[PDB]
Amino acid sequence: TVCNLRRCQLSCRSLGLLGKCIGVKCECVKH
């Protein structure tokens, strides 16, 4: 349906960095 940003974010956060949901694809990015 969509992409759970909060979920995607927290997902990346696992690594320690931050996550972002762009369109329908989330990725782990550093601040």
Side-chain angles (χ1 to χ4, degrees):
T1 288
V2 85
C3 145
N4 281 33
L5 154 121
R6 261 109 202 272
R7 192 175 257 272
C8 120
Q9 290 215 64
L10 65 72
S11 241
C12 292
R13 202 126 77 83
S14 204
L15 257 62
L17 77 170
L18 86 128
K20 235 82 119 101
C21 223
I22 273 104
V24 90
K25 288 218 87 135
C26 233
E27 197 135 304
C28 311
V29 295
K30 155 275 209 283
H31 203 281

